[PDB]
Amino acid sequence: KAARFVRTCDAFNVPVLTFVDVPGFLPGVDQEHDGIIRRGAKLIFAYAEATVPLITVITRKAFGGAYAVMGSKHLGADLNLAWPTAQIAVMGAQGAVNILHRRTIADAGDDAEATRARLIQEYEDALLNPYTAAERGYVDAVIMPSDTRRHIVRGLRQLRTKRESLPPKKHGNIPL
Amino acid sequence: GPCAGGAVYSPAITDFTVMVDQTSHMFITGPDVIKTVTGEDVGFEELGGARTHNSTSGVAHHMAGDEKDAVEYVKQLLSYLPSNNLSEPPAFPEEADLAVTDEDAELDTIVPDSANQPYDMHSVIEHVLDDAEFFETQPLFAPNILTGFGRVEGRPVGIVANQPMQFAGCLDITASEKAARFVRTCDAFNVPVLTFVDVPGFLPGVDQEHDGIIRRGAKLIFAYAEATVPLITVITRKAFGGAYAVMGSKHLGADLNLAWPTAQIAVMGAQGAVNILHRRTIADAGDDAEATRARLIQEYEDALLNPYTAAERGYVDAVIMPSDTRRHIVRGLRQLRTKRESLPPKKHGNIPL
Amino acid sequence: DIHTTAGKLADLRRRIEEATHAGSARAVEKQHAKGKLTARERIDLLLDEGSFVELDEFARHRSTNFGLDANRPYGDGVVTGYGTVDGRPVAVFSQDFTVFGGALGEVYGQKIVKVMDFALKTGCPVVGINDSGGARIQEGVASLGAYGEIFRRNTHASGVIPQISLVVGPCAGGAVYSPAITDFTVMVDQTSHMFITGPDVIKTVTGEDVGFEELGGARTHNSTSGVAHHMAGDEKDAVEYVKQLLSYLPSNNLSEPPAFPEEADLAVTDEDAELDTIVPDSANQPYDMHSVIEHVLDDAEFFETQPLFAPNILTGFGRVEGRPVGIVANQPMQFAGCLDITASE
Amino acid sequence: KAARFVRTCDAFNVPVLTFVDVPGFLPGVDQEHDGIIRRGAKLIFAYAEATVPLITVITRKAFGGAYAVMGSKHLGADLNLAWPTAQIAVMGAQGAVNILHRRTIADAGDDAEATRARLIQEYEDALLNPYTAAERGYVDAVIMPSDTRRHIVRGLRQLRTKRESLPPKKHGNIPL
- Chain B closest CA to A98's CA: distance in Å? 13
d(CA A143, CA A152): 11
SS3 B69: helix
Question: Could you say which of C4, C13, C114 has the minimum Cβ distance to residue B314?
Answer: C114
Q: Which residue of D has its CA nearest to C148?
A: D74
* CB-based burial label for C261 (10 Å; 0-12, 13-18, 19+): exposed
d(CA B147, CA A143): 52
State the sign of the Cα–Cα–Cα–Cα dihedral C153, C155, C157, C161: positive
Q: Which residue of C has its CA nearest to D96?
A: C137
SS3 C134: coil
Provide the Cα torsion D142, D147, D150, D156; round to 10°.
30
B255 DSSP 8-state letter: S
Cα–Cα–Cα angle for B195, B196, B197, rounded to 5 degrees: 115
**β-pair partners for C186:** C166, C230
CATH code of the domain made up of C1-260: 3.90.226.10
SS3 C262: coil
Interface contact flag, C122 B322, Cβ < 8 Å: no
Q: Which residue of D has its CA nearest to C162?
A: D173
State the sign of the Cα–Cα–Cα–Cα dihedral C267, C271, C272, C273: positive
- Using a CB–CB cut-off of 8 Å, the residues of B that contact D are 342, 344
Side-chain-side CA neighbours of residue D158 (13 Å): 10
d(CA D20, CA C312): 40
Q: Quote the crossing angle between the two packed helices B121-128 and B102-110, to the nearest 10°.
A: 150
SS3 B162: strand
Question: Could you say which of B98, B262, B335 has the minimum Cβ distance to residue C8?
Answer: B262
Q: What is the length of chain C?
A: 345
Task: Please report the domains of chain A, with CATH numbers, ordered by start residue.
Answer: 1-176 (3.90.226.10)
**Do the beta carbons of residue C165 and residue C184 sit within 8 Å?**
yes
Q: Which residues of B touch A3 (CB under 8 A)?
A: 353
**Do the beta carbons of residue C190 and residue C213 sit within 8 Å?**
yes
Beta-carbon contacts below 8 Å between C and D = 160
d(CA C241, CA C192): 15
Residue A99's H or E segment, with its range, is: helix A93-100
Which amino acid is located at D113 in the chain? Answer: E
SS3 C316: strand
Which amino acid is located at C58 in the chain? Answer: F
Rg (CA), chain D: 19
Interface contact flag, A37 B9, Cβ < 8 Å: yes
Q: Which residue of C has its CA nearest to B328?
A: C53
Nearest to C105 by CA among C77, C67, C70, C81: C77
Rg (CA), chain B: 22
Question: Could you say which of B108, B109, B331 has the minimum Cβ distance to residue C53?
Answer: B331
SS3 A90: coil
**Do the beta carbons of residue B265 and residue B259 sit within 8 Å?**
yes
Which amino acid is located at B55 in the chain? Answer: S
Which amino acid is located at D160 in the chain? Answer: R
List the alpha helices (DSSP H) in C139-234: 141-157, 177-181, 199-206, 212-216, 218-220
**Do the beta carbons of residue C323 and residue C298 sit within 8 Å?**
no
Q: Cα B256 to chain center, whole Å?
A: 17
Q: Which residue of D has its CA nearest to C105?
A: D90
State the sign of the Cα–Cα–Cα–Cα dihedral C284, C286, C289, C292: negative
Interface contact flag, C3 B336, Cβ < 8 Å: no
SS3 content of chain C, % helix, strand, coil (to 5): 40, 15, 40
Question: Could you say which of A7, A24, A66 has the minimum Cβ distance to residue B350?
Answer: A7
- A165 Cβ contact partners less than 8 Å away, ≥ 6 residues apart: none
User: How many CB atoms lie under 10 A from the CB of residue A124?
Assistant: 16
**Do the beta carbons of residue C327 and residue C294 sit within 8 Å?**
no
Nearest to B320 by CA among C12, C6, C190: C12
SS3 B36: helix
d(CA D24, CA C174): 10
**Do the beta carbons of residue B18 and residue B74 sit within 8 Å?**
yes
C70 has a chain D CB within 8 A of its CB: no
- B324 Cβ contact partners less than 8 Å away, ≥ 6 residues apart: B100, B104, B107
Task: Kindly report the backbone phi and psi dihedral angles of residue C249, in degrees, each rounded to the nearest multiple of 5, phi listed first.
Answer: -85, 160
Nearest to B203 by CA among B253, B234, B241: B241
Q: What DSSP assignment string belongs to B75-107?
A: HHHHHHS-SSTTSPPP--------S--HHHHHH
C78 DSSP 8-state letter: E
Q: Which residues of B touch A49 (CB under 8 A)?
A: 348
Q: Do chains D and A touch (3 or more CB pairs under 8 A)?
A: no
Per-residue buried b or exposed e for C281-314, using 16+ beta carbons within 10 Å of the residue's own CB: eeeeeeeebbebbbeebbeeebbebbbbbbbbbb
Interface contact flag, B340 C121, Cβ < 8 Å: yes
Name the E strands within chain A: 16-19, 54-58, 62-63, 79-82, 88-89, 141-142
**Do the beta carbons of residue A152 and residue A59 sit within 8 Å?**
no
Q: What DSSP assignment string belongs to chain D?
A: -HHHHHHHHHHTT--EEEEEEE------HHHHHH-SHHHHHHHHHHHHH--S-EEEEEEEEEETTHHHHTT-GGGT-SEEEE-SS--EESS-HHHHHHHHSHHHHHSSSSSSHHHHHHHHHHHHHHHSBSHHHHHHTSSSEE--TTHHHHHHHHHHHHHTT--------S------
Direct distance between the N- and C-terminal alpha carbons of chain D, in angstroms, rounded to an integer:
13
Which amino acid is located at B80 in the chain? Answer: Y
d(CA D19, CA C210): 34
Residue C336 zone, left/alpha/beta (φ > 0; ψ -120 to 50; rest): left
**Do the beta carbons of residue B95 and residue B130 sit within 8 Å?**
no
**Residue numbers of C between 227 and 266 with CB closer than 8 Å to D:** 227, 253-254
A174 DSSP 8-state letter: -
d(CA C172, CA C192): 11
Residue B121's H or E segment, with its range, is: helix B121-128
Residue B232's H or E segment, with its range, is: strand B231-239
Q: Cα D165 to chain center, whole Å?
A: 24
User: How many CB atoms lie under 10 A from the CB of residue A114?
Assistant: 10
Mutation site for C-interface testing, chosen from D25, D30, D38 by largest number of C Cβ within 10 Å: D38
User: How many CB atoms lie under 10 A from the CB of residue B23?
Assistant: 14
C100 has a chain D CB within 8 A of its CB: no
C195 has a chain D CB within 8 A of its CB: yes
d(CA B79, CA A46): 30
Nearest to A81 by CA among A149, A24, A5: A149
Per-residue buried b or exposed e for B203-235, using 16+ beta carbons within 10 Å of the residue's own CB: beeeebeeeebeebbbbbbbbbebbbbbbbbbb
Enzyme catalytic residues of B: 5-6, 242-243
Interface contact flag, C196 D31, Cβ < 8 Å: yes
d(CA B165, CA B205): 20
**Do the beta carbons of residue B57 and residue A35 sit within 8 Å?**
yes
Task: Kindly report the backbone phi and psi dihedral angles of residue C70, in degrees, each rounded to the nearest multiple of 5, phi listed first.
Answer: -55, -35
Resolution reached, in Å? Answer: 3.5
d(CA C207, CA B327): 59
Residue C342's H or E segment, with its range, is: helix C341-344
Nearest to D92 by CA among D22, D173, D175: D22
